[PDB]
Amino acid sequence: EIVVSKFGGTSVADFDAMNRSADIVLSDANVRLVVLSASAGITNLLVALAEGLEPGERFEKLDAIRNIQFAILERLRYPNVIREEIERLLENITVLAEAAALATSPALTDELVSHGELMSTLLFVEILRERDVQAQWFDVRKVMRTNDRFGRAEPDIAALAELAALQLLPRLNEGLVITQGFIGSENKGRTTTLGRGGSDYTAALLAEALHASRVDIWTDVPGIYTTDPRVVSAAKRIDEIAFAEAAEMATFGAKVLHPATLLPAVRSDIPVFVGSSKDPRAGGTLVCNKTENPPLFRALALRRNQTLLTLHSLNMLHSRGFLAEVFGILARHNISVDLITTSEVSVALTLDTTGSTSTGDTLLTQSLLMELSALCRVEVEEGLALVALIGNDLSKACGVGKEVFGVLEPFNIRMICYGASSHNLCFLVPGEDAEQVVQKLHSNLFE
Amino acid sequence: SEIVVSKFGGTSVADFDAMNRSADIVLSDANVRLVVLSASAGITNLLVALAEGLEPGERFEKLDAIRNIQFAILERLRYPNVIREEIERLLENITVLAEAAALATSPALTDELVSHGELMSTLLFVEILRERDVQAQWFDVRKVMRTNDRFGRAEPDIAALAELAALQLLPRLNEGLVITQGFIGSENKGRTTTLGRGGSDYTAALLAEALHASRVDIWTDVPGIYTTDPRVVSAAKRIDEIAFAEAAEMATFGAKVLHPATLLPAVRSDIPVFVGSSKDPRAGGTLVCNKTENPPLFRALALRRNQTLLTLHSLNMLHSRGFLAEVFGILARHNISVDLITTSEVSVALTLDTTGSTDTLLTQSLLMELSALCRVEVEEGLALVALIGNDLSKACGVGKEVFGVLEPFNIRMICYGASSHNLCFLVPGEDAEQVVQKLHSNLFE
Numbered sequence: 003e004i005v006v007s008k009f010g011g012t013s014v015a016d017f018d019a020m021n022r023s024a025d026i027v028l029s030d031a032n033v034r035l036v037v038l039s040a041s042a043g044i045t046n047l048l049v050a051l052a053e054g055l056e057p058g059e060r061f062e063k064l065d066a067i068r069n070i071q072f073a074i075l076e077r078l079r080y081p082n083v084i085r086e087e088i089e090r091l092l093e094n095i096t097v098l099a100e101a102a103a104l105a106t107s108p109a110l111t112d113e114l115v116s117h118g119e120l121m122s123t124l125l126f127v128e129i130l131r132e133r134d135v136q137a138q139w140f141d142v143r144k145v146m147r148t149n150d151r152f153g154r155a156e157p158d159i160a161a162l163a164e165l166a167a168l169q170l171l172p173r174l175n176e177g178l179v180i181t182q183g184f185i186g187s188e189n190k191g192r193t194t195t196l197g198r199g200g201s202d203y204t205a206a207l208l209a210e211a212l213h214a215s216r217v218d219i220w221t222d223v224p225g226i227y228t229t230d231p232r233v234v235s236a237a238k239r240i241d242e243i244a245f246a247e248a249a250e251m252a253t254f255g256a257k258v259l260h261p262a263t264l265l266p267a268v269r270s271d272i273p274v275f276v277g278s279s280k281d282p283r284a285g286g287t288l289v290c291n292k293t294e295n296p297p298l299f300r301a302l303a304l305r306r307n308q309t310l311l312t313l314h315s316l317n318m319l320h321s322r323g324f325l326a327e328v329f330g331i332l333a334r335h336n337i338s339v340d341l342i343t344t345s346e347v348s349v350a351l352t353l354d355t356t357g358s359t360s361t362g363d364t365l366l367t368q369s370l371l372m373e374l375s376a377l378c379r380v381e382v383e384e385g386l387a388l389v390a391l392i393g394n395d396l397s398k399a400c401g402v403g404k405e406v407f408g409v410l411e412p413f414n415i416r417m418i419c420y421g422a423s424s425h426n427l428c429f430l431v432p433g434e435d436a437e438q439v440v441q442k443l444h445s446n447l448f449e
Numbered sequence: 450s451e452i453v454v455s456k457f458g459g460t461s462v463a464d465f466d467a468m469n470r471s472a473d474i475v476l477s478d479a480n481v482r483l484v485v486l487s488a489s490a491g492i493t494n495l496l497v498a499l500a501e502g503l504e505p506g507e508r509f510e511k512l513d514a515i516r517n518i519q520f521a522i523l524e525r526l527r528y529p530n531v532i533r534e535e536i537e538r539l540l541e542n543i544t545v546l547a548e549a550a551a552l553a554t555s556p557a558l559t560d561e562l563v564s565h566g567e568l569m570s571t572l573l574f575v576e577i578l579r580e581r582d583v584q585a586q587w588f589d590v591r592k593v594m595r596t597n598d599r600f601g602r603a604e605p606d607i608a609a610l611a612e613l614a615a616l617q618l619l620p621r622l623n624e625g626l627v628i629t630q631g632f633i634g635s636e637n638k639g640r641t642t643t644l645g646r647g648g649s650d651y652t653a654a655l656l657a658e659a660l661h662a663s664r665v666d667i668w669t670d671v672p673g674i675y676t677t678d679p680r681v682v683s684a685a686k687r688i689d690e691i692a693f694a695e696a697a698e699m700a701t702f703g704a705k706v707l708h709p710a711t712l713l714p715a716v717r718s719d720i721p722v723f724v725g726s727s728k729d730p731r732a733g734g735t736l737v738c739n740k741t742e743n744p745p746l747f748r749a750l751a752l753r754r755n756q757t758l759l760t761l762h763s764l765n766m767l768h769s770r771g772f773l774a775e776v777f778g779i780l781a782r783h784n785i786s787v788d789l790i791t792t793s794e795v796s797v798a799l800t801l802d803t804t805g806s807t808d809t810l811l812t813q814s815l816l817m818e819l820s821a822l823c824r825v826e827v828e829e830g831l832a833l834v835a836l837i838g839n840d841l842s843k844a845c846g847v848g849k850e851v852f853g854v855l856e857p858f859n860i861r862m863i864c865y866g867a868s869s870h871n872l873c874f875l876v877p878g879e880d881a882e883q884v885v886q887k888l889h890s891n892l893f894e
């Protein structure tokens with residue numbers, strides 16, 4: 003009967019926040035394992051340093067990190083002892099940072115970055131202790147065995163499960179355990195990280211390893227609703243959603259956590275509750291491997307202001323590699339493609355704003371357009387809104403009738419994507435229409 | 450401006466009888482004064498084979514093959530010796546270039562080699578006509594088809610062509626009928642060069658564009674475009690005029706007929722491209738025009754049966770960059786052309802372009818490389834059904850006027866939004882016919 007709880011950077015951004023999170027932990031007596039990320043902001047400063055910065059900039063980042071740590075220390079009733087550990091860690095970072103300025107590598111990047119999670123974990127244990135709450139510190143690296151793919155270490159499930167039993171379970175029996183997420187260690191001892199989503203990933207991995215009954219992921223959203231309540235107030239809360247559906251949930255990956263991270267939990271049938279740390283009472287949503295009787299339609303997603311790139315060229319006809327090159331170009335220009343539809347001599351795609359760097363004002367630079375125009379007539383359309391129906395049995399080898407199609411009859415559709423998934427059916431409409439479409443589509447499918 | 454250009458592909462000049470049948474079509478219209486020809490059927494391939502460099506043994510089996518085709522036509526002539534030595538001469542040249550190839554190869558050498566195919570057929574065709582007391586002269590396109598040095602895919606210099614055409618081609622056309630080669634050209638430095646697949650059709654267009662031709666006739670193996678495949682819905686009517694933009698989006702136009710890219714010079718210069726059948730000129734054809742009058746919401750529906758649907762699933766493509774870049778890379782490397790593509794959040798489904806690929810397209814080798822980063826699922830026997838038309842898409846979207854059309858059917862995949870002229874989807878084979886027949890009935894019949 004072990005529950006694992008995970009908190010992201012904001013939940014542990016500072017003193018006040020950490021208490022707030024403690025409040026939530028203590029709330030449930032079954033949570034005995036807590037996985038934390040680095041205090042908000044920290045990981046980024048650490049990565050900036052790991053790149054190697056000249057002394058000046060190097061310390062602006064360093065001090066930044068310090069300021070964050072002490073803002074939490076100072077509020078403790080006995081900052082003395084703790085301050086020591088942090089001071090020690092902070093100095094270590096300063097040196098490694100000096101090193102980075104001379105020699106860099108993914109491996110060194112990991113050891114550096116990892117300190118972020120070590121500090122917050124240490125501090126969080128003090129906050130709880132300061133509440134006459136028995137809680138100990140634990141180094142996940144004692145259990146999180148990964149390969150040496152520094153930056154994106156692959157967890158060794160078997161090892162993890164074993165080591166977890168040898169060192170983690172015993173401590174959990176003594177009581178509450180507070181540990182880091184996102185980090186791990188390779189066989190040869192070097193520190194490693196698990197890439198974006200790491201902490202969420204960890205909470206699942208540890209959960210899988212300890213046959214936990216459930217895993218709570220505290221985010222900035224009360225869970226998923228049938229639709230954006232800001233659009234249709236009648237929007238009801240979805241209690242249980244299937245993994246397969248959640249993954250296809252647009253506003254889930256974007257506004258919530260990444261589906262890949264929960265895989266260890268789902269594959270081991272351990273419910274993942276997704277709630278909001280800024281409002282625990284509101285309840286949340288359970289992401290399960292399978293749900294009792296899955297509805298034909300489970301929810302409508304809305305992603306507004308999507309840019310439609312249409313690529314036209316008689317030369318793609320019967321040619322090999324035209325797209326191989328176009329997407330190559332797109333990748334090189336730091337862009338993630340979301341939707342894609344094709345005609346005989348033309349292809350239209352939308353930019354994935356979430357997986358594309360916000361470095362600038364517009365994703366489509368004349369640089370990219372020139373590279374593209376070089377092999378097709380580029381036409382652009384912005385202000386389109388993506389509307390998506392997440393559900394079940396929306397597609398079958400024998401096709402699907404109007405049961406699934408008639409739903410989109412009353413609207414002017416500019417693009418349709420259907421067939422890829424039996425859980426998703428999305429299309430594009432002009433922004434102006436976006437809300438009426440959603441409101442009407444919801445009314446007849448859920449209201 | 451009453452200059453009409455006519456082009457005939459390899460089949461139309463495959464042998465003697467064929468060439469005469471083509472001539473019959475030429476003389477059919479008194480306005481055709483320029484005739485663009487491909488090499489006789491088979492030849493171009495043997496030439497390419499040779500250009501690769503073959504050991505003496507195989508090198509001559511292809512060599513001899515080429516010869517046998519040329520003489521099959523020579524022997525049927527009344528006064529053969531009037532051109533026997535020219536062929537003989539060209540054939541010898543080929544034999545040595547071929548020996549050379551076996552030692553040193555390059556696109557450049559490959560063009561000079563293959564070009565001989567068109568040189569021969571054109572020379573023979575001219576004798577067929579003269580043997581008919583028909584005044585017709587031979588002309589080397591290369592005196593006017595100026596291109597860059599991109600051997601294998603030379604880019605025509607329109608300006609140059611337009612100029613040179615006036616200086617050397619127009620003058621000859623005035624004297625009477627002119628028979629010239631297609632697919633080949635020459636670069637500034639004099640080297641022979643080719644225009645890539647479709648070349649002959651491409652030439653017919655460029656020459657037409659350069660001579661302000663009133664029309665261009667491309668004789669193929671189909672009597673033109675119909676509302677649907679006649680073998681599916683007999684009520685299928687023949688389409689007189691089709692807009693280029695529409696034609697390009699016709700699945701079966703590119704497949705059977707010819708490639709849209711090739712007609713570009715014609716369309717951009719508003720020169721109607723008549724597409725008919727050489728195996729039956731009576732049946733009439735279709736006019737591919739830049740624009741037409743009262744373009745219909747629906748112009749026709751196409752059917753491409755037995756398509757293979759490849760579905761790629763992987764939670765890791767979500768928010769990742771380059772997932773597709775790699776997938777398509779792999780696909781290219783394995784000589785596969787992707788036709789249709791549709792996406793969901795964590796999966797992508799595409800169909801293989803049977804025409805631009807080529808025992809089985811999906812080898813365990815490719816599936817291995819692909820499985821490496823996603824769950825591959827395969828479905829074959831699907832039929833592509835496409836609606837070709839106009840205004841099928843707009844910035845503000847389209848209502849049920851265009852959608853209601855496919856309500857009555859069980860659809861397995863839909864692609865819409867890329868083009869305002871096309872709307873296609875997939876359905877299982879079994880359904881294919883009924884779908885087409887019913888769709889046809891309420892849209893055309």
Ligand SMILES: N[C@@H](CCCC[NH3+])C(=O)O
Nearest residue numbers: 338339340770771772773
């Ligand atoms: N974003 C991925 C493709 C995702 C396709 C499915 N929506 C890429 O840029 O390669």
Ligand SMILES: N[C@@H](CCCC[NH3+])C(=O)O
Nearest residue numbers: 318323324325346786787
């Ligand atoms: N056949 C091209 C893409 C064309 C897509 C639209 N018909 C390729 O596989 O690179």
Ligand SMILES: N[C@@H](CC(=O)O)C(=O)O
Nearest residue numbers: 039184198199200201202
């Ligand atoms: N801290 C890691 C993992 C996580 O936040 O879940 C990251 O920045 O991606």
